[PDB]
Amino acid sequence: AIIYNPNKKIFTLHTAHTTYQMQVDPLGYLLHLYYGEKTNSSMDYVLTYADRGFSGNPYAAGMDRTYSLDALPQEYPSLGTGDYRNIALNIKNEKGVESADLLFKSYEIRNGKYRLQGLPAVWADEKEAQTLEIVLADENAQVEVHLLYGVLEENDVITRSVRIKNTGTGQITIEKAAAACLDFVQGEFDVLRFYGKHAMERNLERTPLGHGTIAFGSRRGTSSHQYNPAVILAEKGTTETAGSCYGMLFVYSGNFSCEAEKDQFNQTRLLLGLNEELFSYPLASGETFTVPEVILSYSAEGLSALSQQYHNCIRNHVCRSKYVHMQRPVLINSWEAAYFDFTGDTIVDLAKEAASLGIDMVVMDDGWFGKRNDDNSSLGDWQVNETKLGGSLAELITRVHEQGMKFGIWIEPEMINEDSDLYRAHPDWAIRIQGKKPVRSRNQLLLDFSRKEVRDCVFDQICVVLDQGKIDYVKWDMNRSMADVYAGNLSYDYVLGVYDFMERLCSRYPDLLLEGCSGGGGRFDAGMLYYSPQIWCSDNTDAINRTRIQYGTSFFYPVSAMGAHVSAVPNHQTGRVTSFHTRGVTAMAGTFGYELNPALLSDEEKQQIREQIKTYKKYETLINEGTYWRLSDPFTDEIAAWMSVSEEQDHALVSVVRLMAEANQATVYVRLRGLKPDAVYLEEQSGRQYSGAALMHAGIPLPPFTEEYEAYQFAFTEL
Amino acid sequence: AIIYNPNKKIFTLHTAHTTYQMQVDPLGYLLHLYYGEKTNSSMDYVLTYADRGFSGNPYAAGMDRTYSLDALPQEYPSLGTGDYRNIALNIKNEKGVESADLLFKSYEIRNGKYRLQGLPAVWADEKEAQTLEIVLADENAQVEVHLLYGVLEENDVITRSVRIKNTGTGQITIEKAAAACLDFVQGEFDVLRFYGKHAMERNLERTPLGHGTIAFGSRRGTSSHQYNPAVILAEKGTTETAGSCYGMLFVYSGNFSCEAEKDQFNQTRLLLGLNEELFSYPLASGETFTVPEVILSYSAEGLSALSQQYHNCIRNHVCRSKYVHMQRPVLINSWEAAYFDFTGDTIVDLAKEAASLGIDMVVMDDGWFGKRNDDNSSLGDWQVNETKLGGSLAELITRVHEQGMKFGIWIEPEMINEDSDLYRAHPDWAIRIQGKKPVRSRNQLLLDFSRKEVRDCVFDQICVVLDQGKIDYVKWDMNRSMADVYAGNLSYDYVLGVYDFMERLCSRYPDLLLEGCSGGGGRFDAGMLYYSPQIWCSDNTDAINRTRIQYGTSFFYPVSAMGAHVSAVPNHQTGRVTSFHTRGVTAMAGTFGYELNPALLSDEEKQQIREQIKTYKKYETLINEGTYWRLSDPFTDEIAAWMSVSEEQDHALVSVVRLMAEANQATVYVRLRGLKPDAVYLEEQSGRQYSGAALMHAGIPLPPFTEEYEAYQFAFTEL
Ligand SMILES: [Mg+2]
Ligand SMILES: [Mg+2]
Ligand SMILES: [Mg+2]
Ligand SMILES: [Mg+2]
């Protein structure tokens, strides 16, 4: 629900269980009053006013020294109000002046959910959602700012976006543009963020917010491996199952900045949006710029509920793929299995092997195009290497189909190698600075996807390939960060170009399952999930590391979105050995699939694959649609444990991987969550019956281990 | 409810919201299965068995090395089972052997609540409570142990006691006897205990339970200032408003020991009961010994609910005084007002002064008997000093009644000074060791209250005094710890004697309001609250320190039980100055009352007294009967804040004392608890209206302070 009280100039946004409230003050400033548990009260009483030294006053406040935007909580604070905190907006006007001082002009409440020009965004129908659009302006800056709030009641989600219009005659530049700001007049908080590196993404870091700023972001041209564009502000003491917490999630696959600051008056400001670095975005007279969307959510009852709200929002209101509500083929991917050393014949052998085990699809990964026999050439040359494939791609697809198998293929359309026909023809199509030798990464360069001519060339090549046969799946990879950034519009316009290509591809091939990828989870974001129902979660396929990566990824993203494959051991990234069973349990927390040559496996491991596939298919709907619960913290605990629970709470699958081993082992219990306390549940394998209360308070004792890194799955059915 | 399953030999105790379960195993041992959230399951599945090195086996386990009482969870573990953890019971038999190895014999379930011979205990009617009595025995020790469990469903309380019988022919000694043991097979816990000193009792100490034992107790002959006989075992992460926590509270005013231990297998054992030090209790053939009661409780939703369960249990099922459900006279006490320097005339002047302010009662404190003109003589000589009083006590009482005032008096019956007629006549009546000069404390000695002849002499003297007129109130003090303990039965039998005297006194004078005291809160325990509806909380009457003392005291004990008086400044114990208003707000969290000479006050402070009394009387029922909530932690926070809420949640009184002051003050909010989220509440003084949700999530901003240690009271009424 969205309500306006014209007398108090208060806007209230209600979800099923939350309330967000803002007010236009007598000077025209849009103040933030409240976000938290549902209330019908007017929360303007929380505002207080004192003469605070060096916190100065708008001219319009006259002699009232107690009114300062350096103290008051705001919806969209800006550089140019006298506020000295981190700010959401900085405009450099047509005379070089950095100032924006925004006053209320008008509003509209609309049924349904706004869409964003050229960008992914949350979507919903006119019954499920409402939109508030508030117009603010600064007549000296000659800017008009449209704040967009999307309210999805059942999901307990409030989205925010911004459109900025130049209303003057000369060009302005947008120098900083956040999508969302939360100002808290009180509270002690921790900041949860998800940091990592290539092949070890999204480790949880949780620290108290001390005085000053905790900040993180990306200027890599991508959302990044290093810091995901996501933040949780948890009230001190909040746990998985109790206490207030707030999320912001950026629906965006490019650069970003997140800032959380505890100020001089013990107030907290949380910002998320575009990075101000390499962002000086020109806006001509009368033109509008759109800031990508942030999904906000609040939980009064801990982190697990907050995550569940995000999972549901992403599955049902971000992902547009038909595969959200369909079985997804269990695939085998050629990359760890063969790297570049394959032929058409060895792809068909992989299909034969995989077919005999119950695998549904073979994915021919990197190495099939140009003269790509290593990673030093051929990106941009998306012509099938028929020498290597021993014939045409059409013939290969048919040979695979004849083994009863679907076919998928890898592409990397944003990239070019110096050693390519494309680069020899068009060296100026690479992102570079004139006169400067560019950074190389994986011995390749980015194509300038801000340029239509560049995108069109590559799009046409990819269409020729995809039109050769029935290709049910594409893995779209992206294997380096952007450098040599030549202008202040490039980072943003590059990503517009990526999304344009992706939209064109998905529209042309609406039955295609598109798996996003960027050296693993280098663009693991809701922007990509708008197009792809799954993203390769990490290049690290070590089961033990995957417990951490998948744990961290679950704070915002649904299990269904996490690409996860059983791979060979010793693991190619770590050298560690894990049992085949443990690899299977860990990879079932995601898409499932395989990425190895099954011909090298023992007959016992081949039979495990057969049984694994049967297990995953049996539980696929539960894993993908069920309510997810983290049952342990793999950074600190003896086990990595999680579970999925059906909507009716009549079925649950519990997964456990042991992380630590000593002699004379203590008994370890796994405590379940999300069941009906008074219901009786049958554990399938053992045939024992337990109340939900018992399972949640005492849990179940794990069988004693006899080897390292042992794993377990337990299924429960309500009687 | 109490249930027996004969086939599984499982006993289940259900309260409204909790379940406690135990089992007799195939060898006859009484194992503890579960205590926590309500469940109908059989929790015996939580038991596990492994061959654990050096954890040995009863002979009766035969060749099964996996069965050990050094590992298994037990209701009442003992020295002599092969268990090496802290234990609940140690018996030294008629041959000198320390061993007790207890096996199940029989049980009974009874409606109603058991009583204890010569001891205070929880009481209830046959509809409100049930009792389980389990009989265990050791035929070699020749001991029979009766475990008593009392179940009070509505209160979510389970009580435990023990009766130990010598079934052999020779004398045994009881060397350790706990009342309660909780064994946890899993969980990470913190231990909350309440430590202090004279004039600074019951500071909260909360630490994680590391491997090893956290222990505390008293061998002072008293429950003590230093460590209260109370413990909370909180699951890691438990807060005031969420998470599992367990209480044990000893209904006993003598020696005790509490031990919490995290063992070699990451299990936790919590014990509370009698101290094993100075405890070697002889039991002749056929005789029974009773261990004092422990009140257990569990909360799944944080510490505040746990405390509320205790408050209700104590008010409605421990305290027997009629004053639990009646207005209590607002009193003025002569001690800080005059110390020993008073006459009958100055007591009547105090009555006159107090009457003009709306005070109901004058309490003549220490100094009225023998030649007690200081604390160096006369304890034991309970004859009125008619020289000092300028006449008889009967005449003094009448003179006070003529001023419209009730009368109260102080006694200290357990004590004797060497300089007394009683000591000159009966020096052997003091507790002492033959041939040894005794410890002196406050230049006095304990009388041996284990001796009937001693008690009878003093009881008769006190009766003569109380029979002189209408004395509505007695403050029974006790101003030193027990030393020179001459035998192993003395600590226990002394306290039996105290309770016998107290029972006789209360039975003879059933309309008397008896306030317990022991240099303040030196016996602030549920044993005393059985007889007294209030206990002088501390000799420290400094308002700022009282915020901490009262906070700590509230973890187990109701506000109504806390004696609290407005006293003069600079404070007599600290030298600190506080405003009269702040003293008033702090002392209203308790009995209220005054302890100063009002003749020395300004007319403005006299008028404050008039208004304070009107305020306390207006809110007396709410403060005493309402649900109590700690709203801040005075050890860490900017404020000491608390509130009381009516049962219907239609009325609340919020109290705040500021603790910290700096320039350019930040706005401090007090967040309320325990209201109805959707209800609308009117704040009385301001006339502003708020939803419960608003008040609990955002709270209310405190008015800015202009002086140090400022206090506030806010009243809310549901519209
Ligand atoms: Mg910039
Ligand atoms: Mg920055
Ligand atoms: Mg002993
Ligand atoms: Mg001890």
mmCIF file of C-alpha atoms in Angstrom, chain A residues 354 405 430 451 467 472 596 632 707:
data_model
loop_
_atom_site.group_PDB
_atom_site.id
_atom_site.type_symbol
_atom_site.label_atom_id
_atom_site.label_comp_id
_atom_site.label_asym_id
_atom_site.label_seq_id
_atom_site.Cartn_x
_atom_site.Cartn_y
_atom_site.Cartn_z
ATOM 1 C CA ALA A 354 27.039 -39.039 -19.926
ATOM 2 C CA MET A 405 21.622 -35.682 -25.360
ATOM 3 C CA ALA A 430 38.962 -2.649 -28.222
ATOM 4 C CA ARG A 451 29.312 0.995 -29.605
ATOM 5 C CA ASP A 467 21.132 -21.039 -35.777
ATOM 6 C CA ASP A 472 19.166 -25.471 -25.567
ATOM 7 C CA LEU A 596 34.764 -34.116 -15.478
ATOM 8 C CA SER A 632 25.511 -23.475 10.539
ATOM 9 C CA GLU A 707 36.719 -40.412 7.074
#
